[PDB]
Amino acid sequence: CQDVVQDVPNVDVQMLELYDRMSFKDIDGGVWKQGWNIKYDPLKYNAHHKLKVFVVPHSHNDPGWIQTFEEYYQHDTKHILSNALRHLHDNPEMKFIWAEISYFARFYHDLGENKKLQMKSIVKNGQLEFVTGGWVMPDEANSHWRNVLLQLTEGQTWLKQFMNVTPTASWAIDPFGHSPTMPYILQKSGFKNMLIQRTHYSVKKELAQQRQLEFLWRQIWDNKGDTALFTHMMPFYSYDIPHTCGPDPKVCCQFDFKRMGSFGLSCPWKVPPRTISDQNVAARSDLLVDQWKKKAELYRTNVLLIPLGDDFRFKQNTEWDVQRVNYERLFEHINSQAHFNVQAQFGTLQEYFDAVHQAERAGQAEFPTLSGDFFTYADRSDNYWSGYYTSRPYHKRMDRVLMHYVRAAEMLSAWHSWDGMARIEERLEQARRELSLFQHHDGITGTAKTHVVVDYEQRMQEALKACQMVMQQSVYRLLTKPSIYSPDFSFSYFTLDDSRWPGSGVEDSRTTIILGEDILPSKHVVMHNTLPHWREQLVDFYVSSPFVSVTDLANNPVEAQVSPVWSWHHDTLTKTIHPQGSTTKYRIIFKARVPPMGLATYVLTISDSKPEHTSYASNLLLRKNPTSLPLGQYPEDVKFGDPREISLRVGNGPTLAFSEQGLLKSIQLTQDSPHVPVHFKFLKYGVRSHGDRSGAYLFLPNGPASPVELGQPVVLVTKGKLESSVSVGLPSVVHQTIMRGGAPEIRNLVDIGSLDNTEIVMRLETHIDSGDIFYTDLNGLQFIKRRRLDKLPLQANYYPIPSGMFIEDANTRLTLLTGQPLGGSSLASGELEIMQDRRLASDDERGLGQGVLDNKPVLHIYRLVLEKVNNCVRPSELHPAGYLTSAAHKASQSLLDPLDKFIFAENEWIGAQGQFGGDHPSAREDLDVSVMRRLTKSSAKTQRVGYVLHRTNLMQCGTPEEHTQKLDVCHLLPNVARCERTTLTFLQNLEHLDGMVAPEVCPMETAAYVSSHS
Ligand SMILES: *[C@@H]1[C@@H](N)[C@H](CO)[C@@H](O)[C@H](O)[C@@H]1O
């Protein structure tokens, strides 16, 4: 394995280093407003060195944005694809590229048998070429890598089955900035080339100046270069026709032949296109070839890419005719006139890349190496697109919940073949496709119209219910004696209990387990652990009595804690946000021990009084002028006090101190160690009254964030042997700190209400001497070094926080792990901050045509890890990556893939078993089974199961990693006949593995295996 810590890769372009050097000046460059007046040597071209030009027709189709998926399909996309089929069939020289398989699959399954055959034929002959072949063209900022891979796999599996093609060139023209997670996944999925568009206008200029727009994009830690994928960055402001022919959009617009005649479109530069004729073709070709030769100056080969398309183009037969016929007349003239030394024709994306690599192999070009990312994007002036890192945070949190439910449903159902009557495959395909659709760059981004967000939310809710149904059927099968198991595939054997989604303060929908001495004295509950190592996590359930004891199914007692059930309410008289105690339901809390990829059964039993192994939390309400606060049967009276500083410690874990406003102020790691200052604060950003307004995309704050008036908020302290918390009712946020014996859990119930033109930020203030350095993750896969730049505006120093962020000095690190993607920064030494929600009255003029005024309450979750790092082996000061510690990685896993909880639905579970997976290997802590998916239906003679293994890299801190077992996924299921390493989509066998053993992967590497079974 490569060492990803000690050796710094040597690349031509390192984006953090380039950012530190760049001036980011926003100068008027002339017709190319953000570049310069390009010159070329006309003698560059001659009969022996021609420019080869590929004009690549395309249509950008959003699977939800202004319309829903289904509205766009019926009004636009089905007509685009119907006209593509007819025009390409009729015109063999015409070409077209297609990205979004969600739409293509919808279209193809509505075709009659003869039209399916004609479609297969224009794909087989290469006229219609799929690019990327994902379900969508995903967001690259907020998306988890697991869901990027899921949607790629959904689209590519469909294309292999129905079109017998697997794209090797990727096309990503609209996401708002670009991540190196994409070449990471694409290069491990058979790709050879990718194309990107939305990068900072000042990056496009800097790379263009050096002809570094085409580069071998490697990962930031990759010293050897085997991760590298050839990348083409488009040079200009847009992918529309005015910005794709060359640098002068006034000229290029005249070659968008839809902008004349009866289509109702026009050129903003006020020179219309003209029909190409014998009379004008020389004059028109003079201007067009001059644009092409200017664009070709920015690249290193004599092969030029000219996209020809725009949003939902090629909808009408007449548009295909007007574009094709006028371009054919131009090609006929140019190719026939030696003085141009051009060969121009319609082409596809793969044809372009094939021709470039042929030029490279002929010695025309040696391409530069590049590492880094392309965040945060700006398309103009100070208009940085960091708003969408936070917009519609309810759905951003829902994405992470559904990610986990899909993983858990696929894994729990994978252990067996299912009869078709169980409809397992149907439910899992529905859930995979709804989650895949949401990865679209108007889905998870929060940039769609309100009614389209409602469609995404309804789809995801269906997907969650489908996963729940698969999971509970699977648990009943895995834990019922075979002598008894006789399933009804429609029946609910278990209900799922989820404490963190939507959250009881958001939707009070948790099931209360109703126990009674002389009716239902006990209930079985089951925990699932999707991670491939033993886990011992606190779990909670709602129960109808506080007098409840826990056992394992073998009747061994389990230590438990009972806490009241609290909810928070506005008082209209006092404006105070105050807690109310339930007199009817209580929380039972205990430690579940669950095998790797396994199940564990417990029993909850009622008694008439305090049982032997159940303790009761104390509750202190800190508020002047207390009113009484009853808790029904709960045996401990609430205590009252005036606001004051509080300290808590659970187990031998850290001691936390809180302010009289219930906000953290210090962490002490051990009895002996210093009280380390760590302050939580809430601030507000506003919007500019004059000049450019924030909206769903853009973050344009009116200066630094302002302190928020908290008043004298009500603080509730629940102190237990197993779990303690401090909760405070702040304006717009119920803020909780929860302690279970290690890194605290932070929960924010965020309700921005009617606070128009407000962004709520949560900030941490420390004395960590971080300077200008901080670290944020990319897609939950890797941590990238950031440098705060005072030469850029505040909004430019905001980055996506898809799963975590940290600051550190030589001695101390503070990491904040997230259960949802949000925008964040370190705007000063020792600080971290992360946006909670944003409510914007204005549109930001990027096409959505609305602000963000559809906010709803959301429960955000976090872990906060303070650690000493002076004994850790850290990368050198030049390394562009950072790595989590073991504790921070485990804390992230606790947020993203918690234990699943199941409540048995009926009164008696005949044949209940205690455990599943007790002899599953418990793998080393840096290894995950990111995916386990049965790939075959029950009718297949050879069953196939696919696994995606990911090995992260964790900082070595002198703590030797104790006894762990070798995980060979090929031997998890019996009767293995073959084990293959495959592409990550499972579509190509790369290696028939010695001994049917799936080897463990290297740090920072992801591998796919498929086991076949007789
Ligand atoms: C591409 C972009 N023009 C929009 C933002 O400006 C985007 O939200 C939408 O997906 C469109 O296709």
Ligand SMILES: [Zn+2]
């Ligand atoms: Zn789009």
